Amino acid sequence: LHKEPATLIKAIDGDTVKDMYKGQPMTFRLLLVDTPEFNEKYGPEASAFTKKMVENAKKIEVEFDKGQRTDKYGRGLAYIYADGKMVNEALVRQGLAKVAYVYKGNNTHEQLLRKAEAQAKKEKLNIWS
Numbered sequence: 001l002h003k004e005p006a007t008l009i010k011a012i013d014g015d016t017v018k019d020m021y022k023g024q025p026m027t028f029r030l031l032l033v034d035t036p037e038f039n040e041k042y043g044p045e046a047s048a049f050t051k052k053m054v055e056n057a058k059k060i061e062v063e064f065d066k067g068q069r070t071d072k073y074g075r076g077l078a079y080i081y082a083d084g085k086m087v088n089e090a091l092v093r094q095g096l097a098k099v100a101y102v103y104k105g106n107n108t109h110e111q112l113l114r115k116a117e118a119q120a121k122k123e124k125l126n127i128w129s
């Protein structure tokens, strides 16, 4: 896998962000996670966490996996990095997302994320509280 450049257009919610990628706007859905909807418990906290992480970064990157790059809604499927730190992993490590939507052949970072989930659970953080 490799990181590619993008620029934030707009944080959307805990697991979606609108970035410009190769000069075109697109909405990215974070691989391998599920944050609560805004209307749900922890949903606002997830949205706020992702927003601050992407808005504060000097450098946003996208990393596609080995399989599907868009989902059925035309959303990009990627791991997103903010100054080198993976947003997907950070959300899981803080108990603000579950590991979810693990489809075969776009699951390169599954075990990293699962390791983070286990530690969030041990710490009884947020969703695990």
Ligand SMILES: Cc1cn([C@H]2C[C@H](OP(=O)(O)O)[C@@H](COP(=O)(O)O)O2)c(=O)[nH]c1=O
Pocket (backbone or CB within 6 Å): 015, 029, 030, 031, 032, 033, 034, 071, 072, 077, 101, 103
């Ligand atoms: C994360 C992810 C979601 N999806 C689709 C599955 C779900 O379809 P359904 O909408 O039919 O439930 C939907 C969940 O995304 P959200 O959690 O953003 O709603 O996105 C993928 O197809 N591939 C992915 O890697």
Ligand SMILES: [Ca+2]
Pocket (backbone or CB within 6 Å): 015, 034, 035, 036, 037
């Ligand atoms: Ca969601």
